[PDB]
Amino acid sequence: MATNIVGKVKWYNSTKNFGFIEQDNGGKDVFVHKSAVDAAGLHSLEEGQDVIFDLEEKQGKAYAVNLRIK
Known part of the structure; x- marks a missing residue:
């Protein structure tokens, strides 16, 4: 129950396609699932990327869905 969220890719290991996201302002541990990637077909993610989900x-x-890259 949250939309158009701010955060940065906290970590992401493509080997399992799992990771987490936190916004620089103190966002909580929301895990990113590949279905979120697949929602937009996000080509690549790694630590540092601002992501909107x-x-x-x-x-x-909490799982991040509907990823959009900055």
Whole structure:
């Protein structure tokens, strides 16, 4: 339940296509799932990238979806 969120790729390991995202302002640990990549077909991510996403919950957990690169 959050849209057009700010954050930066906290870390991302292409080997598993998993990682996390935090905004520089103190965003929480929201994990990025490849479905979010696939939502836009984001070509590459690595640490440093500003990313704009939406956030939906997984029961009580947070996963980033709808990625857009800065």
